[PDB]
Symmetry: C2
């Protein structure tokens, strides 16, 4: 059982919740964690979702090596270097993958010759390693992390930009539709974008309990900057040699940590049904040998019934644990529905179903279970999302002047503020908010994104900070 309160010590709550639901096991190399089966199931669900979707776009999977040679790689303090095999030193040291541009792009130069070879659309599911300097957090910031990375190459900027946006929408679907986590689509500012690219888009999420925005995934319009460094050129139809226009995009096991932080409570995890490996757990109530044979047969019948409706059902008929130990176990683990079947319920042809998010109980006849559970699972899923969306919305404050900022940050909120979008000002702003945060004693404020969904901008509106005329509403806050 979980005992730290989510709203008191958030850190300790998260650690307890992920350990006691058997999602992660700690490890001796710092910043690395073991992903146990209960967490791995959720990743498997989002993986299959995303993978299926990108295949409909013609993206194909591949696997490129985990090693890149020193001279091809040449961010530096993060790179893990292999220097030896056994007691022997490598003639030239080798780096483990931190990203795969330097591994993929020279091959792309070789394979692309003509318009007939475009678009080239590849992905890979793999792990990367970055010797993170920041405080590690299981899922959210780890030194080895699982991800996919998508890398595409096209004839025109328009087609590449369209795929950038399609992928971004798929990531809104991974968070929103699978994980029931609300995200904001935006553009990264010039200071925050991937420097090898032209434009970076993001989906951004929010952790209410510590006030932090967090980048949930990313999708880059790379332009022709990398085609030029790597000599990725093709002949069009009229015999002419052109640079490719490229995209890349990635999303990681960070997504699980965001889910856990978003929906969990004081009793531990709450898993949204769309990604729960066990949607419904059936618990026989077995005590002083009362009806034990008939309770178990009904449990099996109920399961076959529910899986005809494609519900994911487990019977926990394990002998060596009490029914109450099972209630608690599958609560902490975040199973959406718990169906209890004891002697009394057996006599009435009913079952008692407890939903995990609100703790509400229902009495339901065997004949209405399938359609009633499906309805409840759709209500849990929608309800998790809507409550998280309202919290997201409660957490962002529309403002006009710099004077409003530090108070908004102290309330653990984000700010939506009009901004001139000048690179020099973000640097000034972050150095400044850091100063005032140190003095007040918890971190600098930065841009998260410029949201796609722009509210109206009145003609004389000025930038909240410089005073120059503003261009767009930009979302700022503290961040992971």
């Amino acid at each position: 059982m979980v005992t730290a309160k989510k709203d008191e010590n958030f850190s300790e709550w998260y650690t307890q919740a992920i350990v006691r639901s058997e999602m992660i096991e700690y490890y001796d190399i710092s910043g690395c964690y073991i992903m146990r089966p209960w967490a791995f199931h959720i990743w498997e669900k989002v993986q299959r979702f995303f993978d299926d979707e990108i295949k409909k776009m013609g993206v194909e999977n591949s696997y490129f090596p985990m090693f890149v040679s020193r001279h091809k790689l040449e961010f530096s303090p993060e790179v893990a270097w292999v220097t030896h095999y056994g007691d022997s030193p490598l003639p030239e040291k080798i780096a483990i993958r931190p990203t795969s541009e330097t591994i993929m792009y020279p091959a792309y130069a070789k394979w692309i010759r003509s318009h007939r070879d475009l678009p080239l659309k590849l992905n890979q599911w793999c792990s990367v390693v970055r010797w993170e300097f920041k405080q590690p957090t299981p899922f959210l910031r780890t030194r080895e992390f699982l991800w996919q990375e998508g890398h595409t190459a096209h004839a025109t900027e328009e087609e590449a930009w369209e795929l950038v946006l399609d992928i971004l929408e798929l990531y809104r679907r991974w968070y929103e539709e699978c994980l029931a986590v609300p995200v904001i689509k935006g553009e990264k500012s010039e200071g925050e974008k991937f420097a090898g690219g032209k434009k970076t888009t993001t989906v951004e999420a929010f952790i209410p309990e510590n006030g932090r925005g967090i980048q949930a995934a990313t999708s880059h319009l790379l332009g022709t900057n990398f085609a030029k460094m790597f000599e990725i050129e093709f002949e069009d139809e009229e015999g002419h040699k052109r640079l490719v226009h490229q995209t890349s995009w990635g999303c990681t096991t960070r997504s699980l940590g965001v889910m856990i932080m978003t929906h969990g409570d004081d009793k531990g995890l709450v898993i949204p049904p769309r990604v729960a490996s066990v949607q419904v757990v059936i618990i026989p109530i077995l005590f002083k040998d009362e009806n034990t044979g008939e309770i178990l047969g009904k449990c099996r019948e109920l399961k076959t019934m529910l899986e005809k409706a494609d519900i994911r059902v487990r019977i926990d008929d394990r002998s060596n644990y009490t029914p109450g130990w099972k209630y608690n176990h599958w609560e902490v683990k975040g199973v959406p529905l718990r169906l209890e079947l004891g002697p009394k319920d057996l006599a009435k042809g009913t079952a008692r179903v407890v939903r995990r998010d609100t703790g509400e109980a229902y009495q339901i006849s065997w004949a209405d279970l399938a359609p009633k559970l499906l309805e409840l699972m759709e209500g849990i899923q929608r309800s998790l999302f809507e409550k998280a969306k309202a919290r997201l919305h409660e957490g962002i404050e529309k403002i006009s002047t710099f004077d409003e900022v530090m108070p908004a940050l102290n309330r653990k909120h984000l700010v939506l503020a009009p901004w001139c979008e000048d690179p020099e000002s973000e640097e000034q702003i972050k150095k400044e908010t850091q100063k005032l945060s140190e003095i007040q004693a918890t971190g600098a404020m930065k841009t998260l994104c410029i949201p796609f969904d722009q509210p109206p901008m009145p003609e004389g509106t000025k930038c909240f900070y410089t005073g120059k005329p503003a261009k767009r509403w930009t979302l700022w806050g503290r961040s992971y």
Copy 2:
């Protein structure tokens, strides 16, 4: 177009075929290779197949770190890759890249397992492994980075652990024989060949005729209790007494793709079994001038074939002749080509050519889906039955040591009665190597097959002249 001949210059043939088919790209770090979509899709198929099967046995997936600290790993040496720095800074202890995950998984098992009610514990992971192999790299078969799965289970008893060893072994036979159409032989490794951290090692063995080598295809270990003793993986039984767990581990790699390539390939290139082919049917319109008539019909046909779950591509590229296209998709191993030209449009038909034998069929549009489903099953079956006959012809049953070198010189394996004395295997290895030079060349045990031929009473070991135990399969190896 492939030009090295598969029987005559096998090594060149293999390199050409995997490169020209667009399966692999060569890379500047030795023994590492890019797996392009054409190959990777086959990996995805076998992965999905094996993963669904082990999920039915209650095995669950997990991801353990790729890094293991020196003190945990050294609880082989020359193969370990060591990370000593991050950026310009030295780590306090050097970290190994996971050559295999025993030393990463078993301390966690020792934490998680306390009572009989925690058992069985059954995990698998899909990951890559790194070993700095001393032997010559070969794409797929022996690489310095490879993809695999590793399964590791723990049981209250030896008998349940063994049951699982054999079930996993059966799944490996299905990975090879049902998905890749590659015949394999189940058997027990000898004492010198088994995994030394285990009690008994079971295997599926395969055979490459063109160089006469056996190759271990996959492996499944009854580990017994020795790791449980080493890592202190113990549980209280039902009476409160502490007991050691009984463990298994098993694994299979991208080696399997290379075996499939070599098994079914011919002088024109790859031949991919339909169950795993990325494209099962390529539609090649006879075009040189486009008007929409041919291409329109080819789209309608693709839609109809996809309804029947056929993986179809239309090669509508403008600048290639149909002949160039036939060759291209033949080198890639597409099992069925569907040709659609003006004459075909005029007669409501399509001409389908099989990659494995070259036979052509004329088929009405209406009959396409069922006839192609039938062909695919004919191709998959015929690829297997042919490879199985070649495997059979590659093994000579013998009685005496004098029949050995001639059988090895015929690029054949030997099946021989053996006393199974461990000293004798070391001797046979040395004496066959030394005769290979004065004429690696060593002949070693591949396995002791579950399928034993008859052993008449009094049959003698082919090497020691002592009483023979079982027939053992021997040859040159990867």
